[PDB]
């Protein structure tokens, strides 16, 4: 998702009081709306409960290096929460897939949709489920009757872009409290008038 | 839907023809690659170019694909005798959670000269009267191109019910032929004095009439 | 490789259609398989794609839970199940293949395509066709050429072929296409050009072949006596 | 049922380096923000570090924190201990709409 | 004004800090599961103050209560008020001998 030619407020994204986890690196979480950026990139995917700790810069594993790499200069904002009552069902919900095998590493902010069979041995298989060849794409194990570390989690990352462009999507001037009957200073779009 | 394409584009056999495709910021402008396909009227479409950077086997180098940010463009050099098809834009849409195609552009200018049409009117036979229906056929043959309007009259008022027109097909000698039916009943077929079909081709109007009695 | 699909198929408005997708050779039990529909009048759409390895369905949000696609590994084939047909199902389906790659874009490219399935549904289902011979009159013929033929009415479904004397006539034959009616019925024509000297010694007979209905009506053509 | 485990007593001579741990039982330590509060006896607590790496303006540089998500433990490192550092240290979390201290 | 949070935090003498509950300037309230159904906190913007009511207090409720401004709800506070001493004991006040 790309956010452009829009204006938004992150205050309503925080008072939901329903997110199980929230991490924001590169900027202080209370002082991001006033700061203005150029573009906002949002990616949405599902993940298990034991892999939410893997979405961080500076570690190696199975999902964070084969599906979406996190670079060192990562000023993103990752938000995840539990919605296991809608994305899972009885009888085994295997609609979501994931990649387990890869030939080598991948560049960050790159998507891998290769469905070729990964070869482990030194002999070709020509697309067969035999020896020295296994499918890199595998099914999930989601179930609504699981515990807490293996449920389907809805994780999204909000990243910011800093280029030589004017601000496009950023927090506007905050509506402060209205005061009356006092000698105060105000600016209603056309004058800096001081008075009651 | 989310992808819009021009209805048609004009060009010349020897100059550069470029098409422009415009979508949204979540399907093409997000960063996804685009794919172009050719829809020949009668054959299954095939892959022309994927990712706008590689050349598939069996595809000539005259086709060029580029992505100018949010919009993708395709350019060709020279109009050959196989570009009479439709071009579509294919890209992954995150909002639709799947692949969505474009509108389609037709590539033709003019290839249809004029000719002299000839019509034939044949009344229904005797065995057709007992079927409780009356199919009035007025055949048109040996004409070029295949764009003829059909009007039916009963010498007192035009008939605007049951009028049909079939598409014309290429003959053996590169001409076109067509037929027009008219659904009626034998109850009022004998009451009327005569029936006829009236057609107009480039201003040339001919008329043929039959008498049931 | 090449993908071979079945021909035209006509069902009822509210029934279930059953078509197949055959693959010749290999490279069918290694890559994802999807379905493409092209409709004359609008653009192309994509209902969804099914991976044959894990047997996991992946449809689009624009289509509800009505069309289901299954996969087979023993014979390397796929089946399409689609019930509750509506009025706008007159289109053609395509059996496509997906070959993923690596890159910044990572878009689904459709390198391999099938043949096509012309699935049309409407009213006025299969019935008994009626053929009426056509004969010239005295006023219709003025020179040495006369126009005559056979008119075929209320036939279903397409395609219907017309043979003249079991293929004995090849010069001067013309076959006309069909056309939609108000009640969803088709009608064709077939006329030939013959010299008037052979109208009294050689007879012309039309043979109608309709393989979905398995009817072969043979009717004689005779000139009119009054005119 | 998420509780933060902290060492009850930690002793070190001034001028050296010591590490104070904060281990979570059920929830992963990297899921939510970890806040360390240095409270003098008979005084209100004061935030000595936040955001698991961010030091407030006013506290010295020595109050540096680190996160070990593999061991589910939050670490606060103190270098060059002084007299004024003799105070109570508590680590804070959030879990899910229920703030949990150390 | 400003869209921040309020929170009451108590601390028994010689024990760790305990979180009681948090409030918004609106009616949003969340309480600790151990202290659930016993905490009643209300906000009155006219007097520019917020008050907390505790029911069924026992002898184990002796703690130093702190009210703290919460700039960020799931993160740090920034300002701590001075802790009032609350002692729960006995049935009457009596003079010394």
What φ, ψ does residue C197 adopt, rounded to 5°? -75, -20
Chain C residue closest in CA terms to B33: C105
Q: Distance between CA atoms of B201 and B147, rounded to whole angstroms?
A: 8
Q: Distance between CA atoms of C2 and B4, rounded to whole angstroms?
A: 32
Query: Are A4 and B25 an interchain contact pair (Cβ–Cβ within 8 Å)?
Result: yes
CB C7 within 8 A of CB A90: no
Residue in this structure with the two tokens 């279930």, named with its chain if needed: C16
Query: Are B139 and C191 an interchain contact pair (Cβ–Cβ within 8 Å)?
Result: yes
Question: Where in chain B are all domains bearing CATH 2.60.40.10?
Answer: 8-108, 118-210
User: Which among D30, D54, D97 is the nearest to A56, CB-wise?
Assistant: D30
Q: Which two tokens stand for residue C102?
A: 């690596």
Torsion on CA atoms C194, C200, C202, C204, rounded to nearest 10? 60
End-to-end CA distance of chain E: 52
DSSP B126: G
Q: Taking the domains of chain C in order of start, what are their residue ranges?
A: 2-121, 130-221
Q: Distance between CA atoms of C179 and C159, rounded to whole angstroms?
A: 12
Residue A131: how many CB atoms within 10 A of its CB?
Answer: 10
Total CB pairs under 8 A between chain A and B:
8
CB E2 within 8 A of CB E79: no
Query: Are E80 and D44 an interchain contact pair (Cβ–Cβ within 8 Å)?
Result: yes
Residue in this structure with the two tokens 């003079």, named with its chain if needed: E95
Q: Coil, strand or helix: which one is C165?
A: helix
Which of A10, A13, A17 best probes binding to E when mutated, by most E CB atoms within 10 angstroms? A17
Q: Which residues of C touch A110 (CB under 8 A)?
A: 102-104, 106
Chain A residue closest in CA terms to E5: A15
What ranges make up the beta strands (E) of chain C?
2-5, 9-10, 17-24, 33-38, 44-51, 56-59, 67-72, 77-82, 91-98, 102-103, 110-112, 117-120, 130-134, 145-153, 161-164, 173-175, 187-195, 205-209, 218-220
Chain B residue closest in CA terms to A43: B94
The CATH superfamily holding the domain C130-221 is: Immunoglobulins (2.60.40.10)
Residue C201 makes CB contacts below 8 A (sequence gap 6+) with none
**For chain A, which chains pass the contact test of at least 3 CB pairs under 8 Å?**
B, C, D, E
Query: Are C176 and B177 an interchain contact pair (Cβ–Cβ within 8 Å)?
Result: yes
User: Which among D31, D33, D51 is the nearest to A52, CB-wise?
Assistant: D31
Q: Which residues of C touch A114 (CB under 8 A)?
A: 100-102
E19, burial (CB in 10 Å: exposed 0-12, middle 13-18, buried 19+): buried
User: Which among E3, E30, E72 is the nearest to A29, CB-wise?
Assistant: E72
Which of D44, D65, D91 best probes binding to E when mutated, by most E CB atoms within 10 angstroms? D44
Torsion on CA atoms C163, C167, C168, C172, rounded to nearest 10? 60
Residue B94: how many CB atoms within 10 A of its CB?
Answer: 16
Is it the case that chain D and chain B have 3 or more CB pairs lying under 8 Å apart?
no
Residue B7: how many CB atoms within 10 A of its CB?
Answer: 8
B20, burial (CB in 10 Å: exposed 0-12, middle 13-18, buried 19+): middle
Q: Coil, strand or helix: which one is B151?
A: strand
Sheet bearing C77-82, strands edge to edge: C2-5, C17-24, C77-82, C67-72
Resolution of the deposited coordinates, in angstroms? 4.0
CB B91 within 8 A of CB B26: no
* Nearest alpha carbon to residue E31 among E52, E60, E62, E3: E52
Long-range contacts of B59-68 (CB under 8 A, 24+ apart): B63/B36, B65/B34, B65/B36, B67/B28, B67/B33, B67/B34
Q: Which two tokens stand for residue A85?
A: 């009552």
Query: Are A17 and E73 an interchain contact pair (Cβ–Cβ within 8 Å)?
Result: yes
Q: Distance between CA atoms of B105 and C223, rounded to whole angstroms?
A: 51
Chain C residue closest in CA terms to A138: C54
Is it the case that chain A and chain C have 3 or more CB pairs lying under 8 Å apart?
yes
CB D101 within 8 A of CB D46: no
A102 touches D: beta carbon within 8 Å = no
Query: CA of A25 to nearest chain D CA: how many angstroms apart?
Result: 9
Q: Which two tokens stand for residue A62?
A: 């199975």
Q: Coil, strand or helix: which one is C179?
A: coil
Residue B33 makes CB contacts below 8 A (sequence gap 6+) with B50, B51, B52, B67, B91, C103, C105, C106, C107, C109
Q: Distance between CA atoms of C192 and C209, rounded to whole angstroms?
A: 18
Query: Are A21 and D32 an interchain contact pair (Cβ–Cβ within 8 Å)?
Result: yes
Total CB pairs under 8 A between chain B and C:
118
CATH of the domain spanning B118-210, picked from 1.10.630.10, 2.40.30.10, 2.60.40.10, 2.40.480.10:
2.60.40.10
**β C9-10/C117-120 pair status:** parallel
Quick one: fold of B8-108? Immunoglobulin-like (2.60.40)
Chain B residue closest in CA terms to A110: B31
Query: Are D51 and A20 an interchain contact pair (Cβ–Cβ within 8 Å)?
Result: no
Q: Distance between CA atoms of B14 and A126, rounded to whole angstroms?
A: 45
Q: Which residues of D touch E32 (CB under 8 A)?
A: 98-99
Query: CA of A190 to nearest chain C CA: how many angstroms apart?
Result: 47
Stretch (H or E) spanning B186: helix B186-189
User: Sign of the C-alpha dihedral, residues E7, E8, E12, E14?
Assistant: positive
* Nearest alpha carbon to residue B142 among B181, B112, B168, B106: B168
What φ, ψ does residue E56 adopt, rounded to 5°? 55, 55
C-alpha count within 13 angstroms, C-beta hemisphere, residue B180: 20
Q: Distance between CA atoms of C112 and C91, rounded to whole angstroms?
A: 20
Residue E57 makes CB contacts below 8 A (sequence gap 6+) with E88
C-alpha count within 13 angstroms, C-beta hemisphere, residue A104: 3
Cis, peptide link before residue C72, omega less than 30° from 0: no
Residue D12 makes CB contacts below 8 A (sequence gap 6+) with D18, D81
Class of the domain covering C2-121: mainly beta
Q: Which residues of A touch D54 (CB under 8 A)?
A: 28
């Amino acid at each position: 998702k790309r956010i452009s030619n829009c204006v938004a407020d992150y205050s309503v994204l925080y008072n939901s009081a329903s997110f199980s986890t929230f991490k924001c690196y590169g900027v202080s979480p209370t002082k991001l709306n006033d700061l203005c950026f150029t573009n906002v990139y949002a990616d949405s995917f599902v993940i298990r409960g034991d892999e939410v700790r893997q979405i961080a810069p500076g570690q190696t594993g199975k999902i964070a290096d084969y599906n979406y790499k996190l670079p060192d200069d990562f000023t993103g904002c990752v938000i995840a929460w539990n919605s296991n009552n809608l994305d899972s069902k009885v009888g085994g919900n295997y609609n979501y897939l994931y990649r387990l095998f890869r030939k080598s590493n991948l560049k960050p902010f790159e998507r891998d949709i290769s469905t070729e069979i990964y070869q482990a041995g030194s002999t070709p298989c020509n697309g067969v489920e035999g020896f020295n060849c296994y499918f890199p794409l595998q099914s999930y194990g989601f179930q609504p009757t699981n515990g807490v570390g293996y449920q389907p989690y809805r994780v999204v990352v909000l990243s910011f872009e800093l280029l030589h462009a004017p601000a496009t999507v950023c927090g506007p001037k905050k509506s402060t409290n209205l005061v009356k009957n006092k000698c105060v200073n105000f600016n209603f779009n056309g004058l800096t008038g001081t008075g009651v | 839907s989310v992808l819009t394409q021009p209805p048609s584009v004009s060009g010349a056999p020897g100059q550069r023809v470029t098409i422009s495709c415009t979508g949204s910021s979540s399907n093409i402008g997000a960063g996804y690659d685009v794919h172009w396909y050719q829809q020949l009227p009668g054959t299954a479409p095939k892959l022309l170019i994927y990712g706008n950077s590689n050349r598939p086997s069996g595809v000539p180098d005259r086709f060029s694909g580029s992505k100018s940010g949010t919009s993708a463009s395709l350019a060709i050099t020279g109009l050959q005798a196989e570009d009479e098809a439709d071009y579509y834009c294919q890209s992954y849409d995150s909002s639709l959670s799947g692949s969505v195609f474009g509108g389609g552009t037709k590539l033709t200018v003019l290839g249809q000269p004029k000719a002299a049409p000839s019509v034939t009117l044949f009344p229904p036979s005797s065995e057709e009267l007992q079927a409780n229906k009356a199919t009035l056929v007025c055949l048109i043959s040996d004409f070029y191109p295949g764009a003829v309007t059909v009007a039916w009259k009963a010498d007192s008022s035009p008939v605007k019910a049951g009028v049909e027109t079939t598409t014309p097909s290429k003959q053996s000698n590169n001409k076109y032929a067509a037929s027009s039916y008219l659904s009626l009943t034998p109850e009022q077929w004998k009451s009327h004095r005569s029936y006829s079909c009236q057609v107009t081709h480039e201003g040339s109007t001919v008329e043929k009439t039959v008498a049931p009695t | 490789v090449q993908l071979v699909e079945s021909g035209a198929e006509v069902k009822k408005p509210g029934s279930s259609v059953k078509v197949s997708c055959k693959a010749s050779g290999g490279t069918f039990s290694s890559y994802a398989i999807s379905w493409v529909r092209q409709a004359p009048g609008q653009g192309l759409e994509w209902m969804g794609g099914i991976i044959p390895i894990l047997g996991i369905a992946n449809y689009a949000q624009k289509f509800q839970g009505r069309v289901t696609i299954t996969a087979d590994k023993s014979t390397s084939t796929a089946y399409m199940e689609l019930s509750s047909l509506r009025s706008e199902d007159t289109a053609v389906y395509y059996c496509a293949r997906e070959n993923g790659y690596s890159g910044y874009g990572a878009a689904a490219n459709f390198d391999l395509w099938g043949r096509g399935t012309l699935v049309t549904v409407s009213s006025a289902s299969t019935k008994g066709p009626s053929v009426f011979p056509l004969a010239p009159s005295s006023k219709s013929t003025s020179g040495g050429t006369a126009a005559l033929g056979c008119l075929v009415k209320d036939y279903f479904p397409e395609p219907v072929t017309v043979s003249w004397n079991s293929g004995a006539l090849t010069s001067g034959v013309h076959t006309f296409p069909a056309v939609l009616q108000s009640s969803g019925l088709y009608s064709l024509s077939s006329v030939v050009t013959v010299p008037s000297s052979s109208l009294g010694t050689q007879t012309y007979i039309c043979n109608v072949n309709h393989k979905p209905s398995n009817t072969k009506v043979d009717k004689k053509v005779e000139p009119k006596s009054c005119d | 049922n998420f509780m933060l485990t902290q060492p009850h007593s930690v002793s070190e001579s001034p001028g050296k380096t010591v590490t104070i741990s904060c281990t979570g039982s059920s929830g992963s330590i990297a899921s939510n923000y970890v806040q360390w509060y240095q409270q003098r006896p008979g005084s209100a607590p004061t935030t000595v570090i936040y955001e698991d790496n961010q030091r407030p303006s006013g506290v010295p540089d020595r109050f540096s924190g680190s996160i070990d998500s593999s061991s589910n433990s939050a670490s606060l490192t103190i270098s060059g201990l002084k007299t004024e550092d003799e105070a109570d240290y508590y680590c804070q979390s959030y879990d899910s709409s229920n703030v949990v201290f150390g | 004004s400003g869209g921040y949070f309020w929170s009451w935090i108590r601390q028994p003498p010689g024990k760790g800090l305990e979180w009681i509950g948090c409030i918004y300037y609106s009616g949003s309230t969340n309480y600790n599961p151990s202290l659930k159904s016993r905490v009643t906190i209300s906000v009155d913007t006219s007097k520019d103050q917020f008050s907390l009511k505790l029911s069924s207090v026992t002898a184990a409720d002796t703690a130093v209560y702190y009210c703290a401004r919460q700039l960020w709800l799931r993160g740090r506070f920034d300002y701590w008020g001075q802790g009032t001493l609350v002692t729960v004991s006995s049935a009457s006040t009596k003079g010394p001998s």
